[PDB]
Amino acid sequence: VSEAQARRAVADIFNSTLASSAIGAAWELGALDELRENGKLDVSDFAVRHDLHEPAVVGMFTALASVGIVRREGATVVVGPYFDEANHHRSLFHWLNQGSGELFRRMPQVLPNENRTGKFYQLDAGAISYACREISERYFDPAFWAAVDGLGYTPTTVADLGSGSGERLIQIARRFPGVRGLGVDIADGAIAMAEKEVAAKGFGDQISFVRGDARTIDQVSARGEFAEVDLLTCFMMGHEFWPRENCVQTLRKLRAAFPNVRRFLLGDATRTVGIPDRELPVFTLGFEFGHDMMGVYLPTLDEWDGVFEEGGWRCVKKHAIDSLSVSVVFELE
Amino acid sequence: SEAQARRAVADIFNSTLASSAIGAAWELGALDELRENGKLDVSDFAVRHDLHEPAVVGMFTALASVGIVRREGATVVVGPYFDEANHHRSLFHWLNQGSGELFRRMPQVLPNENRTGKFYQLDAGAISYACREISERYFDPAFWAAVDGLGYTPTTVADLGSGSGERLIQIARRFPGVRGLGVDIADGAIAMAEKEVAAKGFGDQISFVRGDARTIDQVSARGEFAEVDLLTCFMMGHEFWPRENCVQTLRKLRAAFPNVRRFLLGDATRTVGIPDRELPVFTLGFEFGHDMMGVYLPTLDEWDGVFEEGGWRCVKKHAIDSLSVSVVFELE
Numbered sequence: 001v002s003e004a005q006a007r008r009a010v011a012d013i014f015n016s017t018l019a020s021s022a023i024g025a026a027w028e029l030g031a032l033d034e035l036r037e038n039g040k041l042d043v044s045d046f047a048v049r050h051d052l053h054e055p056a057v058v059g060m061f062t063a064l065a066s067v068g069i070v071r072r073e074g075a076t077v078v079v080g081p082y083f084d085e086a087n088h089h090r091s092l093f094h095w096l097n098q099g100s101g102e103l104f105r106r107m108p109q110v111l112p113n114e115n116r117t118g119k120f121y122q123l124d125a126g127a128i129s130y131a132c133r134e135i136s137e138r139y140f141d142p143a144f145w146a147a148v149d150g151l152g153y154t155p156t157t158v159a160d161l162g163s164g165s166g167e168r169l170i171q172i173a174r175r176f177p178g179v180r181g182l183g184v185d186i187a188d189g190a191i192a193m194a195e196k197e198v199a200a201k202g203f204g205d206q207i208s209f210v211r212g213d214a215r216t217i218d219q220v221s222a223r224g225e226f227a228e229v230d231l232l233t234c235f236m237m238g239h240e241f242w243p244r245e246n247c248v249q250t251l252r253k254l255r256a257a258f259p260n261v262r263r264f265l266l267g268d269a270t271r272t273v274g275i276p277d278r279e280l281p282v283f284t285l286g287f288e289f290g291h292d293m294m295g296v297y298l299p300t301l302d303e304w305d306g307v308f309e310e311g312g313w314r315c316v317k318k319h320a321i322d323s324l325s326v327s328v329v330f331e332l333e
Numbered sequence: 334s335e336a337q338a339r340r341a342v343a344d345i346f347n348s349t350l351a352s353s354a355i356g357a358a359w360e361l362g363a364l365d366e367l368r369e370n371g372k373l374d375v376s377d378f379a380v381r382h383d384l385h386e387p388a389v390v391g392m393f394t395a396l397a398s399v400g401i402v403r404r405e406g407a408t409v410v411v412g413p414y415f416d417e418a419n420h421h422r423s424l425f426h427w428l429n430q431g432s433g434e435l436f437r438r439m440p441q442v443l444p445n446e447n448r449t450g451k452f453y454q455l456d457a458g459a460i461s462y463a464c465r466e467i468s469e470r471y472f473d474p475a476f477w478a479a480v481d482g483l484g485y486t487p488t489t490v491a492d493l494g495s496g497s498g499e500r501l502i503q504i505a506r507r508f509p510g511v512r513g514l515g516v517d518i519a520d521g522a523i524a525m526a527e528k529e530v531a532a533k534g535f536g537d538q539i540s541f542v543r544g545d546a547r548t549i550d551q552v553s554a555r556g557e558f559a560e561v562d563l564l565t566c567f568m569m570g571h572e573f574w575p576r577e578n579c580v581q582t583l584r585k586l587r588a589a590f591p592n593v594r595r596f597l598l599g600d601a602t603r604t605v606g607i608p609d610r611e612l613p614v615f616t617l618g619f620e621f622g623h624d625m626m627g628v629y630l631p632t633l634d635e636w637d638g639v640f641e642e643g644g645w646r647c648v649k650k651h652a653i654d655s656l657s658v659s660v661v662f663e664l665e
């Protein structure tokens with residue numbers, strides 16, 4: 001390449017950083033929904049309506065425009081050639097930046113081994129939760145509902161491992177009005193958020209929550225309710241069960257603690273293999289590099305496939321997700 | 334086409350991690366190792382610097398995802414954009430390690446209701462580490478060209494926003510007799526600069542004082558200002574703004590430094606009309622960053638238009654290559 005080509009490529013990498021951050025912010029502030037409905041927007045009007053500092057609002061749209069996501073026309077912003085694609089994956093940009101940005105920013109301090117004890121990185125939990133709701137819905141739901149449609153029975157008590165916001169249990173209780181639900185989450189803040197949200201939607205008597213580590217599910221006290229659970233779900237946290245030996249034992253413990261579970265629906269993103277560096281798709285690099293930074297194991301799809309029998313489960317159906325890196329839903333029994 | 338859009342959006346995502354990795358790779362030693370040898374071994378690098386190797390691999394994968402380096406097994410090689418990205422490594426460091434929190438917290442920083450008190454956070458030590466190389470890499474040519482055209486030998490020099498003290502030191506090395514005086518608003522700045530200066534043996538020659546250069550009249554160091562025959566102010570001048578404040582600050586500086594012959598003022602400025610898809614490195618970060626921080630940023634013609642009211646005359650102006658649109662003015 002020429003020096004001019006390198007110059008353009010490096011300027012684009014710099015601007016991409018600002019656009020990337022802006023995709024999450026623009027989602028969250030309501031701009032991308034406006035642009036997807038009407039195809040355009042007036043930046044002063046948008047700034048007044050949402051009581052935002054207009055000079056910053058101009059930067060945000062400029063940052064998006066600098067890489068072809070939107071176009072600026074006088075007072076107006078219109079959707080650019082990459083709008084649909086960036087909008088589709090906006091929760092992933094949110095996750096990377098608003099949720100995870102401080103991890104990546106602190107690369108020089110996170111990488112040194114002597115630094116890597118106790119609290120050594122900081123995520124924004126609320127922001128991660130904010131993004132995870134759309135990540136679940138947008139990428140996981142169709143496979144999730146296809147698995148639910150093919151259960152071959154009607155659930156009476158469902159337990160969700162890593163229940164977070166409580167939304168999955170709420171949706172299951174809408175599909176199956178008899179159903180009792182039980183969410184396990186390790187984070188007491190998620191427990192508080194979930195109990196609150198469930199109560200406001202009218203489900204406080206049907207759905208309840210317990211703080212607990214699903215890696216040590218054999219220690220969770222939930223008034224003997226686990227024995228009545230006949231459906232188990234776990235989405236977007238199963239990599240936490242790994243390394244392999246930890247995972248085998250966690251699966252057996254799940255198997256013994258939920259002895260009346262018929263189907264166990266397990267959904268997660270996985271570590272890819274042999275994608276060429278210049279062909280990496282959205283998410284993949286951030287998912288893998290981030291967990292490598294945090295010290296968290298990420299299995300491949302073949303590692304999952306290979307653990308289940310030893311774990312006490314049989315995989316009877318598998319669904320490919322489009323495309324949140326390489327992600328899947330397993331139907332286990 | 335849907336495929337192009339997919340590739341482009343993936344590139345934007347990956348560029349975020351590469352961007353952050355440039356600064357990190359600088360800081361950690363990897364960029365200089367690649368400069369020397371053109372290549373390096375990942376395991377070796379990790380072991381030498383005692384780094385968690387899975388993360389080190391992701392760092393390089395990040396740089397590789399967009400062409401800065403190329404991976405060949407366990408080896409990393411300089412890539413097509415290595416020279417350009419290394420050249421600008423301090424601007425990535427500034428964008429990410431320095432100012433990343435500001436940009437991450439965009440959703441919280443834009444609402445007016447939240448814009449009171451300390452409503453954004455910068456990493457001051459990181460900013461200072463990037464600004465030190467920014468000074469030397471982008472402003473040195475024009476700064477020294479201005480020094481060469483002074484037409485006198487300075488006896489006492491003052492530097493506003495002296496930071497690390499490096500400018501004073503370098504002046505001292507070029508004009509052995511000279512005395513230096515630095516003024517910085519932050520005690521962090523005063524501390525390092527004072528240590529640095531002693532370590533280098535310039536302790537009698539160069540001293541410092543905490544002070545706000547916007548209100549230079551209330552700086553009770555006073556004594557030596559009258560001696561100063563050269564004033565310098567680099568990468569903070571936009572702090573004097575908005576306009577009316579800048580007029581006052583310039584007049585105050587004129588009157589607090591009456592024997593100053595030349596005043597060398599260098600800074601980056603707000604550009605005008607650059608089309609969005611042709612924005613060069615830094616511009617957008619600098620401008621959008623100052624807009625989120627609520628700080629005024631003048632264009633070059635605002636600066637041109639303020640010196641006379643401010644009590645100075647611009648005798649020579651130097652364009653900079655290219656830190657957005659940057660400039661050094663020679664005022665008297």
Ligand SMILES: Nc1ncnc2c1ncn2[C@@H]1O[C@H](CSCC[C@H](N)C(=O)O)[C@@H](O)[C@H]1O
Nearest residue numbers: 136162164185186187190213214235236237
């Ligand atoms: N070992 C563990 N045991 C229980 N909960 C866990 C856990 N590790 C992570 N979590 C929880 O798992 C959640 C992952 S965020 C995704 C949540 C949810 N399954 C959904 O699809 O929306 C967080 O709430 C976190 O607190």
Ligand SMILES: Nc1ncnc2c1ncn2[C@@H]1O[C@H](CSCC[C@H](N)C(=O)O)[C@@H](O)[C@H]1O
Nearest residue numbers: 464468494496517518519522545546567569
């Ligand atoms: N109003 C003000 N008065 C004095 N110093 C200021 C200031 N606003 C910012 N600064 C200082 O300006 C410096 C900016 S960065 C370092 C610039 C230095 N002139 C150089 O070329 O290397 C910081 O040390 C900061 O404390």
Ligand SMILES: C[C@@H](C(=O)C(=O)O)c1ccccc1
Nearest residue numbers: 095128132135236237268269
């Ligand atoms: C929730 C998140 C994750 O692993 C993390 O934030 O550590 C995640 C998991 C799976 C797909 C997308 C994001």
Ligand SMILES: C[C@@H](C(=O)C(=O)O)c1ccccc1
Nearest residue numbers: 460464467568569600601656
């Ligand atoms: C010091 C920095 C700046 O204004 C900031 O960090 O807010 C700066 C000024 C001018 C050129 C580059 C960086």
Ligand SMILES: O=C(O)[C@H](O)Cc1ccccc1
Nearest residue numbers: 304305308315316317318330
């Ligand atoms: O081994 C697999 O591919 C999956 O883990 C589950 C599966 C196995 C056999 C038939 C269907 C699904």
Ligand SMILES: O=C(O)[C@H](O)Cc1ccccc1
Nearest residue numbers: 636637638647648649650662
């Ligand atoms: O107005 C300008 O362009 C500069 O601020 C200073 C200058 C003016 C005239 C001749 C040289 C320099």
Ligand SMILES: [Ca+2]
Nearest residue numbers: 040041042076
């Ligand atoms: Ca409009």
Ligand SMILES: [Ca+2]
Nearest residue numbers: 068071080081
């Ligand atoms: Ca365009």
Ligand SMILES: [Ca+2]
Nearest residue numbers: 105106108430
């Ligand atoms: Ca840092």
Ligand SMILES: [Ca+2]
Nearest residue numbers: 119120121122
């Ligand atoms: Ca920390």
Ligand SMILES: [Ca+2]
Nearest residue numbers: 176177178179
């Ligand atoms: Ca029912």
Ligand SMILES: [Ca+2]
Nearest residue numbers: 222224225226
């Ligand atoms: Ca129980």
Ligand SMILES: [Ca+2]
Nearest residue numbers: 259260261262
């Ligand atoms: Ca059974």
Ligand SMILES: [Ca+2]
Nearest residue numbers: 281339340343
């Ligand atoms: Ca792609």
Ligand SMILES: [Ca+2]
Nearest residue numbers: 301302305306
């Ligand atoms: Ca397989």
Ligand SMILES: [Ca+2]
Nearest residue numbers: 372373374408
């Ligand atoms: Ca080698």
